[PDB]
Design a binder for this molecule. Sequence first.
Ligand SMILES: N[C@@H](CCC(=O)O)C(=O)O
Ligand SMILES: [Mg+2]
Lengths: 182, 363
Amino acid sequence: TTHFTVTDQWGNVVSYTTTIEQLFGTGILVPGYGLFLNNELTDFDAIPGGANEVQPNKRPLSSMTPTIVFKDEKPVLTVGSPGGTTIIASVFQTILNYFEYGMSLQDAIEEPRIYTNSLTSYRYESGMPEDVRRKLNDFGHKFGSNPVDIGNVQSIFIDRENKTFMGVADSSRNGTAVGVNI
Amino acid sequence: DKVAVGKDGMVATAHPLASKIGAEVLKKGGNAIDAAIAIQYALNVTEPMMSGIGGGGFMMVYDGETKETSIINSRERAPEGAKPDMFLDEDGKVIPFSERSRHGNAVGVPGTLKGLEAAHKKWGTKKMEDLISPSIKLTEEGFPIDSVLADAIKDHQDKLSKTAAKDIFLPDGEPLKEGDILVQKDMAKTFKLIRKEGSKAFYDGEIGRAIADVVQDFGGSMTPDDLSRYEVTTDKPIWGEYHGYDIASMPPPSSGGVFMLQMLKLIDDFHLSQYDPKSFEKYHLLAETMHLSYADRAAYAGDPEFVDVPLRGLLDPDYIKERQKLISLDSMNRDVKEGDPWKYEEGEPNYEIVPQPEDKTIG
Ligand SMILES: N[C@@H](CCC(=O)O)C(=O)O
Ligand SMILES: [Mg+2]
């Protein structure tokens, strides 16, 4: 999974999350083509009978969440992560940090995340203070004894008032942002 | 450089040698879509473990001009030979994720290539060759691998041995280190071929048939018929407002849009910014909120062509109220269950709730 974003001079905005599932997908390289093959179908639930059971021709459920935020019918921010099922959580938390805490955009991204999808699954980015982790786990949570990097947000903010764009890449990977002038 | 500013364009990508290439497209007068396309090819070559034409994606575009927003949904489809219980062993037990993960049955028909072509012409104003050439150079002449790619290869030695990949990612005995040069001659071959005969080399060509071969070689049921049948779609976004902003995100068959919005809707009424960002209060309220939304996803997410997902109900103001009852500072909710969003949308489920296990997209 990767996410990448582009904005141009005619007001087009691209938020694009794209993947082959697991790293290298299935692992399979189409022989004499070099192409790595997805295992995307394993996003399907195993035990059948649900809404996300396997069916012929069915696209298996994704967690990809390419997003654009708009202020007054006009796009202002672009957000998207990879990280499997944690993507939802990453984007949501970025958005919080940017609009609810009014953080600088980079600060929004770099602010430690948590993810947890049941009472049995917790993950956290380094940065959550120990006293805090300890107090959470007393209360009934299961934050592991060591942290993990969650997601990789790239995002582009569109600055009307200064007529510019800001772009930022999460440090979780070696992402990079580069503007264009003229 | 991790941050940057631009007037006439901007681009931010997972890999510096992708970025960088999109920027060149914009510098030449090409538009965002042109650049996005170029980037996907570049990432395919430079970040090969993450994204690819042997996979799928969701491309959200805001138009010009038209000022509408749309999404090129190029997510893979299961071949006609796939079966609801194909992931159970002969005892009816779920096959270990590590095993399912690599089997032929796991590989869905790749959609990304058709999706790029769809976007190009809908919007695209360059190619049908210029945007793919720079990626062909990196495939053919190679490039030095970054930390993240180096570590992918190391962390997946065992998967990568089993496959044709070992010749080129595990050259002699071991896996390339940071700085070693990765050359993908065969991938370049394929990319040159994509440039010439278009997409149909893939869905009606030798590559399509080549893939059908391997999926079957590994226990899969992909035929070239399946490939030839495959179609991208365009989706209109799922919207929602929050702190005075309109957000456009992914509808089913992605879980992302709904539940990210739901997560915000649930959390909004608490006004977290009263609390320090790294305060117990916050993490707990975030945690509890996640639990609720993710439980809903586990019961009601799925391709809407096949199932009915209560989008209205999942984001109903009255649903939010019902569920926010569960979320307190004075305890952690232990009874993590799906809500009943059907009480707010006309209809009922065309499916059940199957409890599920553990999917190694973790460590
Ligand atoms: N299976 C994930 C993407 C793969 C990953 O991020 O590991 C999804 O589409 O939601
Ligand atoms: Mg980070």
